[PDB]
């Protein structure tokens, strides 16, 4: 039949493509930029707002804003611009002719889903629609039916355990601590070396510093003493204007906040304790199979050395006779989109779409009893 | 001739096979499981209910229920599922071509037999049928014609005396105290060490703890005083998730309730007093031969040290010049099935089958005239 | 003789006072708080831990922890702080010159009693001591000698039937589901309207929302269909910082989990089914008098409309000719303490105390011989 | 006793004195002037550099430079001259006999504070030393233990919330926009009337014009229309050589950049939004007491009409039931020095000084361990 | 439609022409001359004032005055004479039939623009008018949309950065040091060789000496030693009356005041430091494109060797990995006029003219609304 469009709306990036492929076609940041200075050259291309990668190339004269925060849309006018840009400029496919599969985080407010369905049916005029959960799609991509998925992107961290294809909804955990908080913490602790970043366009520089120079230590208190002894911890970075900076402790002190959220001033547990508590809220007869298939998903799980640290911590938390195995596949930054592409092409799935007739009959509230 | 199918329906397990063998082919628990969570992975096998060993393998997501309680069927819709599973999946033999031999406990209501015969003739379309008493089949298996059989399984304890092939029906006794009450009592007294079991799937763990660590003391008070002296009474057990527990007095305090039913809050005599009272309701000229052949059968008689305790107690109750002998054969957990297999293959038994013609002529009430 | 001190140690609150009064003098929460930030103003009070009502007043800079969970002490060092605070700051009475009466839930582990007795004799140097069951003190307060008490506080729900002063210990039931689970369930389902509570200090706000806006419906399904029709179900609440929230279905969906524990993901029966099963494990001659004196006790029974719902459900379960009567007295939140005050002042009770001489002679194990 | 010396080093002025007084003795500008012309009269007193008030009296033949910019020292050789002038010419007290208390802004680089400690111990040979935060001293002076202090001087604007004596370090915010930027902006917008200021001495003249004629409007957009109607907005000013200038809109357009930083071309939020965002990063249970005590401190908060404007803006941002109270006391240009004088005289403080022995033992890095 | 008249009013010269050409038609000095002696020959022409090139031919009997100084008009009666001469004698085109495009320096007083618009609408009766910035027209002429323009003529030096067609107004810098100051400095230092010029007509001779014999050194301190070693530096010049003078160091000491304004007794930075500071006030993401398109404009940039010196100095100031490229076009003395001619002929520009109707409606203050 006709192929579907798979759109993964994250807090940081937008992953989009066509169902049946092995990778998404379009990946661009979810930002909307507006000029802060006046234009004076007659004959230029005057535009009110810039979207996506165009806002990244000319961020020097723009103010940057994210419409999504912690998985929740906070500005629907900019979200609609981003979706228009995705449909007509990046994929170049009419949404009136394809069914659209969307994603969302668990334990979200219901108005988010309802507004999403309403916009998709009344603004873009799609034939069919569906909203899935991101970690479930990650497990679809993994190829298994039993495991606990740890998903961490830019806004939300969450764990979802599943056994033999059955959901354990009372065991779902959610943590509002992700890559954006780590970028802000790094920007804050860079002030100790004498480096100041304040604006929106310098936050994009700090994020690249983080993605290029940060790693996870196997034991924090020992690295805090081994690095203080020599200078082989220090690395250099060249700014867009030719200046050079050097970073030391900040390379591993920044992602340590995933395991000790009190560096940020948050009364919350790390990701290892959250995964352990999510496993312990399941029945005693299924914990043995969850300990062996801990699955990593998202961009924030791509630090160097995260699997060994997680294995060591959960091994310390768990009994001595269990076998803990964390699986960190390559290309796990796109596993949600890959799982959604796999799901939307099954022959048994073609009866779960929300169609235009059911929407005209019942309104936007049907998403609560058809998509879960 | 055409061989028969022998089906021993217990409260706890099903024993099935073909007449002429020395052991039953299929032994599985008599449970029906139903999922309590929603299934979310598209492409899975969506079953409504699980039966037998499959319900035991995935009990972590299921609610377990027994259709038989105290030898009486309390849910016929699930009993029909269990019988279908027994005929078509375990034995893989058409019941339309073999006569079926069923079992039952003595002193049961008549509606049980009538519903059983009606289902066997109208749902499975058997050619012939028969319902026997379990303790009599146990003596068929023993190879003797004189003795008193003490049968104890999961729901019912009963004694039946027989003298040279003749029934003594006024001396049959029945006790509603068996392995399931002992499992519940162990689960109740485990709270003293700080262990809490509540669900249907944890009861199956408590039952295995009981079958692996419990034993019968020769003298209860001296054992209670001796165990308090040292720690050589304590054993260890590993839970399905790697945790370790330790049990002490509970090892012999749990099956002591077979002899002192007041631990459970019941006004009833132990099994030794019941066997004695059953012997004493016989004629004075027969008691000498019953004292010398006391036969044990069933799963609840498999405790270590039960024969010596029973011999000691009955010797104390009986006159000094009688010779008490308890016989506990190995494989006494299948002696009912073995005796039924023996009975269904005798050449003189082939005229006692209830035929389809007699059923169509008189209805399901013929079970009271052709069986006893 | 000298008066006694009555201390009711619950999971949520401490009730303390002197024997002979009609109400306890000190009621404060059972919490220990520790600062999570550094103190910088020189000249301030440097306290390491805050107990009781002082931890509630400054919960903004503290992490709150409960030392008791499900009626079982999990941190004895904090329990010792709470008892010190109770004896020296609230009542201001020397425990060296008063006998102390403590309480406990039924079916607890034995170490919980032994450690309590050891602390009371070795740390506070009391002359005498006693440990009683709470649901029995509730009936002492009721003034009767026959009835079944349903006690429900913050940690444990339990029922105890008693007939003319005689215990029926084989019919005691226990359910690990109380007000704290309902607070957590309300906090979980508030996410649907867009409200996020995560820390220990926000849990204390959710608990107050529950105690101010929740009620029990007579029929759940008709209420779910009726509330969806209009907006007269919605109520407003003002947060400590001036924000306003509004709640709908959550008002009666939260306490419905007392009757349908599957909302929480638990395989267990409601309180009505548990009371019925507790009455049915008694003798047929005593059930008629238990159906007529169902007594309510505890904080979780203070919901508006619980007596009528319980009467309706137990009427549906019981035979048609029985007269079911639920008695819900005012001031039933202090009935355990009132019953203890009554018991400790009887002249016949003055020989049941555990004295210092017996403890020095036999150790902490005497609590299993002199108490029950 | 031996009293301490309290030295408040700002970007604009030096405040110095002796601990125990109610006002600082010496207040002079933090400038170092050098002659730009040759000296020709034989017999004059030749000097290489002029410091403090002498550089202001003869600024006609000098080039003026500030060694401190945005709270960070950019030229240590001139900082040493200023400290020598402060110790030997203004206070006339040997630093070898008194302990010295210094100040600093929050979120500064560490090398700044380390150089301060090193110079104070190796150049001036002090017995003891300490470095505090300015906004905390302002609250010491205010006499409270709860509030948020908005400090604004010549280089840095910062807010620090404090509750019941406890620091909330994750909610500290820093803004690089203060009086010097306002002086430069007024100098830039005076070109519209035809007045041109370029040099350092003319910059001092412009700063004096700003301190004498500028004020804050309650509503900017209405003030821009009311002033365009008449000429009652215009004031006159006499230059050092007898010329007369007149200023209009610039009286309230210049300090409006504190609330709209885009007049300067900065992507940053005003002081009202910064105070609000600093309050909102605290816990919900603490905000009510911070709204009620907002403390102003520094020279840049001395504009007429700042309290009413700040109250109106924060009222607009906050919920309608909160009570916002801004407190702006007289002498708030010296409140940092007064708070430091109070702190350095407490008896409980005499164990927090960094001593010469600890410095010889550990080096300059002990300031990160003993100070915060 | 009708073509426009482009008039570039500099401090030194007037550039005029018609829109659509590649070079201006009329270039004459902006001078007004009045006779200082009596005319005695009867029959001569009795003029009261001479304008333009005629005042240059007979400067021997005239006093010469400039009406414009540092970009500001200081005598409007002579300005009207110069404009009348430009319109009726040089171009010979009626201003009543053509729209007029004027130019101005940035950061000028507003009365200048207002008086220009008033005179153009009330004295010459133009249909439309517009006032542009000179440095922006230079970039219009260069053909780019990104760069920083260094414009230096006779009165003012200024730098304007532009990125992708957007203005950066907070980074505009202005320096009151240009060719006229260099002429006065050369006239002053020529006194060392024995040459004395005092009058206006001799200042016009010193300007020609400067334009014919001055050049910029690559390194000043080394030229001051290399030239001291020989006479190859000496050049000769013939005065209007036949005398011969010779110049040495003055050839490169005179234009060295552009890079060291302290030769003139001025507290200001050179042009290289001013350009660097104007680049550093832009955002870090833009500086890379401004370093590579530094554009020169005006007559004071026509010295031999200025591009290499500017490149060397900016390279020394900038980081080592940036690529600095100064572009010095031939015919850069008319690039402002060429850019204005290009601008006034675009089809999109024909709606930005200030027309007679808007002026009659709003007065001369509309120049602040329609021109930026
Ligand atoms: C990091 C960057 C450039 C850098 C200048 C690149 C170079 C290579 O680093 C230095 O030169 C280190 C030096 C420094 C100064 C003192 C010291 O003991 C150690 C280092 N730091 C400085 O000059 C500080 C002073 C400062 C201002 Br004002 N407010 C701040 C707020 C917090 C912290 C410090 C400050 N400074 C000018 C900045 O941060 C500026 C605003 N930052 C940028 O433009 C960003 C976009 C790129
Ligand atoms: N190599 C890397 N190492 C560490 N973090 C990374 C890396 N690459 C991306 N990230 C972080 O991952 C986040 C984006 O992950 P993604 O899963 O695409 O976000 P979302 O799905 O929420 O849009 C960014 O905040 C970025 O900082
Ligand atoms: N080794 C053992 N020791 C003690 N009890 C056992 C043992 N094996 C099984 N049982 C008990 O015997 C019961 C099953 O006995 P069985 O004869 O199968 O009963 P039924 O015929 O009613 O199914 C179970 O309740 C189990 O607890
Ligand atoms: N008015 C009320 N309505 C409903 N629940 C209440 C009310 N008051 C208190 N509760 C609940 O009762 C619990 C405390 O009950 P209580 O029996 O005093 O505690 P404890 O378990 O310590 O004895 C708390 O969890 C609280 O949520
Ligand atoms: N009356 C006033 N009104 C407005 N601003 C003032 C006034 N007096 C001083 N200022 C400004 O305060 C600044 C110095 O304040 P202060 O806080 O003492 O400086 P520092 O940053 O050195 O502590 C100067 O920039 C000055 O412009
Ligand atoms: N070849 C040259 N070399 C150096 N300076 C020159 C040269 N030609 C003209 N100038 C200087 O340029 C100035 C006039 O330049 P111009 O840009 O036309 O002035 P404006 O635009 O201000 O009218 C005069 O002061 C003159 O000294
Ligand atoms: Mg994602
Ligand atoms: Mg059996
Ligand atoms: Mg209680
Ligand atoms: Mg200050
Ligand atoms: Mg010019």
Numbering used by the authors:
A (entry chain A), B (entry chain C), C (entry chain B), D (entry chain D), E (entry chain F): 5 to 376
The authors write:
For direct comparison, we also determined the structure of the non-decorated Act1 filament at an average resolution of 2.6 Å. We reconstructed the Act1 filament alone and obtained helical parameters that were similar to our Act1:MyoA complex with a similar rise and a 0.7° smaller azimuthal rotation for the complex. However, our highly-resolved density of the Act1 filament allows us to see most of the side chain orientations and details of ligand binding for ADP•Mg2+ and jasplakinolide, as well as putative water molecules, including several in the vicinity of the active site. The Act1 filament has an internal cavity, which is extended towards the filament exterior. We modelled density in the cavity as a chain of water molecules, but we cannot exclude presence of other solute molecules. The end of the cavity is formed by the side chains of Asn116 and Trp80. In monomeric Act1, the cavity is much shorter compared to the F-form. In muscle F-actin, the cavity is limited by the bulkier Ile76 instead of Val77 in Act1. In our structure of the ADP-bound filamentous Act1, the side chain of Ser15 points away from the nucleotide, not contacting the ADP phosphates, thus more closely resembling the conformation in crystal structures of the ATP-bound state. Instead, the Ser15 main chain NH group interacts with the β-phosphate.
The mosquito-borne parasites (Plasmodium spp.) that cause the disease depend upon an unconventional actomyosin motor for both gliding motility and host cell invasion. The complex includes the malaria parasite actin filament (PfAct1) complexed with the class XIV myosin motor (PfMyoA) and its two associated light-chains. One of the class XIV myosins, PfMyoA, is essential for gliding motility and is the best-characterized of the parasite myosins. It is unusually small, consisting of just the canonical motor domain and neck region that bears two light chains: essential light chain (PfELC) and myosin tail interacting protein (PfMTIP).
